[PDB]
Design a protein around this ligand. Structure first.
Ligand code: 3PE
Ligand code: 3PE
Ligand code: DXC
Ligand code: DXC
Ligand code: DXC
Ligand code: DXC
Ligand code: DXC
Ligand code: DXC
Ligand code: DXC
Ligand code: DXC
Ligand code: DXC
Ligand code: DXC
Ligand code: XBE
Ligand code: ZN
Ligand code: ZN
Ligand code: ZN
Ligand code: ZN
Lengths: 334, 332
């Protein structure tokens, strides 16, 4: 322990130790989402954003990794299924149509989930970046703990242990910044909770009662990063130094409109490539975007801006790629 | 005329039927005890396989026109019927949970055979009553969003406000024994007909809106849809005014325990009794298999229906149960 940014707790709750943060939010009702991307008749969306059928549906076998490499599947938004070092773990699972506490108001995904809970292979762990309704889905937790359970190791930030138990999960681990743990079975892999510049909120006045963050999974064979939700911040340089080089990093590239406002909690594609450089990863996956309209940008804009920023930094789509809904990708290491 | 209409108690709608008795006491702490226990995904694939509808692989097989009659079961009471230049949906529920909340309520154990975007052009939807497993807010939004005036909403008395607040302009409030039609081709008639059930969505809105059943009289085929009901008269009356019918969709589920349910939910024997009363050639067996709204085994209703069919001198052909997503072309 020499020079890591730690928490990061004001009076009772946690602010971001990062300097760029400014405290002023006015939340989500009808206001900035509105319709400035204008998703048209679904056939348009099928052409632009085709939802694929994941490999583990047609071929339920083959869903391991056979050590060596690293397989990844994008299940919309921040839902990512990662297979490595004899483990298959999900990240920020959202399978409901609506990311909201109500059934009558809230952002409803314009792209259906590539698969269902019953159809996915045996999960060994779930990673929760923060507690927002588009990353933490009550019904999804219910489904996973109904099919899985005790066998499902939930890795959550500080403050969500109570919530997880109230949902009905027994194998739950609260982690603080730079804290680590593992799956009981496979001790060779370590799951570390690492900083991020975001916030937490589900109800009134519980703002930041629970922590946010990012996850670093250190296997013997593969190293993986998952940013979650964040604006640009110096803690990703710290992550790239302490850990790294990583094999895959999942970086949000969406919901970066009113930068003047979002920039403190949401990178844009330029800042996303900035993250990719910071974390010292070999490859990066474009998560967020494409699933929910959580900001004002055109729903196809973030990939275009990502390619522009990639060219800016002298990189190619190979280094930082965007998948289709349900598409998979295998990556074998040196 | 003999037609038994009704009614208007000193405040809400009665059933006016003799058998009605006090039997409500909402199911939030009532028979929650789930003793049918659907589980074991292996059990669900074998027991209740969800089929993939024809209009998925061949969306153009919209059928209809052919003088006959096609039906597709999309779980619970959600049924798509195509005949006599019409494709109309009935009691559409596509959400997982039939509840006003996202945290409590009956979550279907058999997911919907298809989604809203995948179905062919629907010309009409029929709403039997306002319960959360027959009237689904999100489904209504979806259809009036993909569709608009291109949707004939037929609702009981008291539901016009709800539908307009949802955003539908093509809505018709009916009192049972009243008729109407779809603008384009008026040759087909939609009639709201009696039934023995109740209505409730919130606190103190008990029976503010009517329940009932639907009779669709085309030039070529006549079709009945019961909706939700316990056994009561007027099914003979329905068989009298119109009929003989070609198809009837009769609920066969959510009947146990009997002492509580008999007055608003038929059992399969009473379903066969309805089949006889209404004068239909064939029957489709709706409700059941999708949501657990009672204590009976989730597989029991088909067995009890076949037992009652043998009982009443009828064959499985006369009263058939489809699989989830299966279709059937009842011609002639
Ligand atoms: C009084 C009645 C109040 C009625 C309100 C009911 C409708 C609330 C709809 C909530 C919609 C949530 C949207 C999904 C979500 O979590 O995303 C918004 C935000 C995190 O989104 P992110 O991807 O970080 O990008 C957005 C940039 N701001 O995360 C958030 O902004 C957190 C969501 C804040 C709203 C909290 C919900 C209201 C509290 C309900 C309890 C009231 C019961 C009494
Ligand atoms: C504290 C405030 C109150 C909290 C209650 C919130 C939880 C309510 C859960 C509702 C679950 C609905 C179940 C689905 C449904 O409609 O089926 C039950 C019944 C119709 O079922 P049926 O097919 O006719 O036969 C089954 C026989 N039980 O239909 C019904 O019984 C209709 C459902 C009535 C629910 C009323 C809820 C109103 C909202 C209260 C919140 C207001 C506070 C502000
Ligand atoms: C706009 C209405 C009331 C209108 C009025 O009477 O003026 C108000 C009353 C309830 C308010 C919500 C309460 C919960 C939230 C509190 C946040 O700190 C701001 C966003 C939310 C989601 C609020 C949004 C909005 O400010 C609402 C919906
Ligand atoms: C659902 C009831 C009324 C039902 C009825 O009496 O028929 C209405 C009455 C007051 C309504 C709220 C008033 C403040 C807000 C107004 C916004 O424009 C939409 C969100 C809110 C938070 C509304 C949500 C909801 O639409 C409420 C709670
Ligand atoms: C009970 C009706 C729906 C009735 C129906 O569909 O017939 C629903 C519709 C809108 C819902 C409200 C929306 C705003 C609020 C959302 C909160 O997360 C819970 C409390 C409130 C005040 C909700 C209470 C209740 O859940 C309402 C009023
Ligand atoms: C009330 C139901 C269960 C009711 C039943 O037995 O049918 C319970 C089951 C799980 C419960 C939730 C667990 C997670 C959350 C814990 C919070 O500290 C309060 C809100 C939430 C969202 C809870 C709300 C509510 O208390 C729920 C949904
Ligand atoms: C009104 C009851 C009961 C009062 C009590 O237990 O003393 C209280 C108990 C718990 C309260 C809820 C807990 C979860 C949420 C906490 C938020 O910070 C504000 C909104 C919510 C949704 C609260 C709204 C409401 O105020 C509740 C439901
Ligand atoms: C049992 C609790 C209260 C617990 C206590 O006694 O402290 C009570 C409080 C409010 C009650 C609900 C009120 C609305 C409904 C009234 C019906 O007649 C039965 C079902 C419902 C949905 C009730 C279910 C249950 O009877 C609840 C949830
Ligand atoms: C989610 C809040 C608060 C949780 C917390 O902050 O600790 C809890 C506290 C009070 C809870 C309610 C108490 C009465 C009811 C009890 C029933 O068995 C389930 C539904 C109801 C309506 C409960 C729903 C939910 O479980 C509530 C609203
Ligand atoms: C706002 C939290 C969700 C918090 C979370 O998801 O973490 C949810 C969880 C349980 C929800 C309650 C369930 C019972 C009631 C359902 C009604 O139709 C609206 C009012 C009540 C009292 C609900 C209010 C609100 O919708 C609650 C309290
Ligand atoms: C409050 C939102 C819309 C808010 C917005 O436009 O941003 C509105 C939009 C549609 C509204 C619903 C329409 C159908 C119902 C009408 C009832 O008489 C009251 C409950 C319901 C379920 C309404 C609840 C609430 O009033 C909703 C959900
Ligand atoms: C707090 C407002 C008062 C505003 C008004 O006078 O309209 C009241 C009056 C109208 C109320 C709604 C009317 C329809 C529903 C009646 C239910 O039995 C409880 C939930 C609902 C959804 C109510 C929630 C809430 O109790 C509201 C929104
Ligand atoms: O568990 S799943 O089989 O993966 C699952 C879970 C939910 S739910 O989380 O919201 O209950 C779903 C909700 C919808 S809907 O359009 O919003 O009604 C559709 C499909 C779903 C599939
Ligand atoms: Zn967020
Ligand atoms: Zn987000
Ligand atoms: Zn009913
Ligand atoms: Zn029903």
């Amino acid at each position: 322990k020499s020079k890591k940014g730690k928490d990061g707790r004001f009076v009772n709750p946690w602010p971001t130790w990062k300097n760029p943060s400014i405290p002023n939010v006015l939340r989500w009702l009808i206001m900035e989402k509105d319709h400035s991307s204008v998703p048209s008749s679904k056939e348009e969306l099928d052409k632009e954003l085709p939802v694929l059928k994941p490999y583990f549906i047609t071929n339920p076998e083959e869903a391991g990794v056979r050590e060596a490499g690293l397989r990844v599947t994008w299940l919309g938004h921040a839902t990512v299924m990662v297979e490595m070092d004899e483990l298959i773990f999900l990240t920020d699972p959202i399978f409901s149509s609506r990311a909201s506490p109500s059934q009558y108001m809230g952002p409803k995904r314009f792209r259906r989930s590539p698969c269902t809970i019953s159809e996915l292979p045996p999960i060994d762990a779930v990673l929760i970046s923060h507690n927002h309704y588009d990353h933490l889905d009550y019904n999804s937790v219910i489904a996973l703990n109904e099919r899985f359970g005790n066998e499902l190791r939930w890795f959550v930030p500080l403050g969500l242990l109570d919530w997880m138990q109230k949902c009905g999960c027994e194998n739950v681990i609260e982690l603080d910044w730079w804290e680590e743990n593992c799956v009981p079975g496979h001790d060779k892999v370590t799951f570390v909770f690492t900083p991020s510049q975001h916030w937490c909120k589900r109800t009134l006045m519980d703002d930041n009662k629970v922590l946010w963050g990012s996850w670093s999974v250190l296997g013997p064979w593969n190293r993986f990063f998952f940013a979650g939700d964040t604006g640009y911040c110096p803690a990703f340089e710290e992550i790239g130094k302490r850990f790294g080089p990583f094999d895959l990093a999942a970086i949000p590239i969406g919901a970066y409109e009113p930068r003047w406002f979002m920039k403190y909690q949401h990178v844009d594609p330029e800042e996303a490539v900035r993250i990719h450089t910071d974390v010292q990863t070999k490859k990066s996956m474009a998560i967020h975007w494409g699933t929910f309209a959580l900001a004002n940008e055109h729903y196809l804009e973030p990939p275009v801006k990502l390619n522009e920023a990639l060219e800016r930094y002298g990189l190619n789509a190979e280094d930082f790629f965007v998948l289709k809904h349900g598409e998979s990708r295998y990556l074998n290491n040196d």
